[PDB]
């Protein structure tokens, strides 16, 4: 059961490169692609993310996309840069200028067919393809515009497969341009229609965690990417190691998505580490309380402001399964109002013996109605500019029409009202 990984744009390639470095270490794969691990329980499901090449080499089933060579040249030089298939680097020369329209309609449309040729080649060499996972940001131009363009084209060619994304939401606290609410709203509109599951990784939440919790006053993208790669590792553990719960993308979607449009997940992680941090190993009760706390959410939403439709918890490392079950049952009994009563047993728990890194950790995946706070924040920012048609010339100049913006704004407002409807049920 193979997954085809695609990473697009600066953010998509930076978080994507970290994800591959992290899991390559976990699976005992070195930068040359050779296996040198101390367990085989690393190679049991290695084929989910890696292909097997000539001299017993494991090659990531990853496709690196960007309209600018810069970020991809940085990857090719980084630690695990040589692990990727050289043919799978697909890049243009004229970037996207943080413009969704350029990535989706003009610059991106010129490069998209060559990317699909690589996607097709990777798919044809799959015994049984489960689907695709895309890493990207929604505030830029390549990952946002060209990424959603790729999703649309892939869906047309593989309508019966799962489309999963790790989508980095933009925030004024960690911003590159004022047009981020435009790019994000346009991308969310695409995501609501063409993805089965999206992990909402909020830069606002990643910033507040680094600043308020870790006390990293003046955090860098590297600091935010430390949390991201750790969360990405946790949420994909069930797909990379032998397990019974959410072992593939489809079963995960069936367990987590009660309504087709409501597929935006709020990840959580514990303990919150800081690059090069100190000594203790968090008890099971401590892991559980933290992963459910607003301060550990990777989306800037207060779960106490909504209700959980479904939840998937994953514990990693050697620990008491009896204690895990007691702690998991306790969080629900102590906060039963924040879990919808009309979805019985909506909190599932998995445990993996192999820890990340750390001695023991816990990853949370929640489909909460509080996620509307993220879409409300973006919608507010989008409307503040769209109301006065600010910066629209950059988009209309690429061929886009104002009607397209009105539809994206409306679809996202509908998404918010749908999340609110199920919160009042």
């Amino acid at each position: 059961r193979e997954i085809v990984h695609i990473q697009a744009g600066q953010c998509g390639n930076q978080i994507g490169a970290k994800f591959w470095e992290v899991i390559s270490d976990e699976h005992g794969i070195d930068p040359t692609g050779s296996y040198h691990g101390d367990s085989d329980l690393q190679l049991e499901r290695i084929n989910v993310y890696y292909n097997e090449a000539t001299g017993n080499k494991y090659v990531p089933r990853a496709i690196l996309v960007d309209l600018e060579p810069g970020t991809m040249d940085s990857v090719r030089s980084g630690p695990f840069g040589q692990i990727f298939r050289p043919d799978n680097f697909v890049f243009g020369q004229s970037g996207a200028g943080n413009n969704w329209a350029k990535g989706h309609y003009t610059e991106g449309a010129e490069l998209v067919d060559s990317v699909l040729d690589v996607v097709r080649k990777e798919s044809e060499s799959c015994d049984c393809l489960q689907g695709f996972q895309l890493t990207h940001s929604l505030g830029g131009g390549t990952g946002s515009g060209m990424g959603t363009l790729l999703i649309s084209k892939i869906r047309e060619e593989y309508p019966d497969r799962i489309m999963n994304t790790f989508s980095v939401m933009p925030s004024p606290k960690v911003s590159d341009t004022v047009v981020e609410p435009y790019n994000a709203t346009l991308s969310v509109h695409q995501l609501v229609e063409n993805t089965d599951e999206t992990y909402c990784i909020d830069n606002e939440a990643l910033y507040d965690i680094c600043f308020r919790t870790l006390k990293l006053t003046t955090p860098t993208y590297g600091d935010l990417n430390h949390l991201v790669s750790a969360t990405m590792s946790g949420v994909t553990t069930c797909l990379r190691f032998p397990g019974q719960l959410n072992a593939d993308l489809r079963k995960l979607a069936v367990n987590m998505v009660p309504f087709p449009r409501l597929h935006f997940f709020m990840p959580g992680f514990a303990p919150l580490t800081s690059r090069g941090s100190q000594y203790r190993a968090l008890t099971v009760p401590e892991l559980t309380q933290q992963m459910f706390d607003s301060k550990n959410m990777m989306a800037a939403c207060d779960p106490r402001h909504g209700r959980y439709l479904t939840v998937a918890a994953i514990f990693r490392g050697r620990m008491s399964m009896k204690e895990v079950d007691e702690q998991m049952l306790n969080v629900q009994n102590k906060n039963s109002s924040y879990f919808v009563e009309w979805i019985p047993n909506n909190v599932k728990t998995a445990v993996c013996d192999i820890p990340p890194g750390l001695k023991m950790s816990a990853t949370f995946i929640g489909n909460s109605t509080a996620i509307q706070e993220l879409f409300k924040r973006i919608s507010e920012q989008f409307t503040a500019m769209f109301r006065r048609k600010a910066f629209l010339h950059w988009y209309t100049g690429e061929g886009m029409d104002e009607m397209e913006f009105t539809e994206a704004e409306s679809n996202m407002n509908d998404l918010v009202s749908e999340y609110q409807q199920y919160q009042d049920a």
Binding site: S152, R155, E156, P159, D160
Partner: protein, 53 residues
């Protein structure tokens, strides 16, 4: 307490009474299966049509 012994080989059985009282055809399945198959094919066609637009 009525008892009724029946057969005895590698063990034995009996009954004790305390108190007396007071097809779809093969075609029929195939039609439903194909009816669902067409609904699947149709929904996929509607999606691809919407993507073509």
């Amino acid at each position: 307490e009525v008892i009724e012994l029946n057969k005895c080989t590698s063990g034995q059985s009996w009954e004790v009474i305390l108190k007396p009282p007071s097809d779809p055809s093969l075609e029929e399945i195939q039609k439903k299966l194909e009816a669902a198959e067409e609904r699947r094919k149709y929904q996929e066609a509607e999606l691809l049509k919407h993507l073509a637009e």
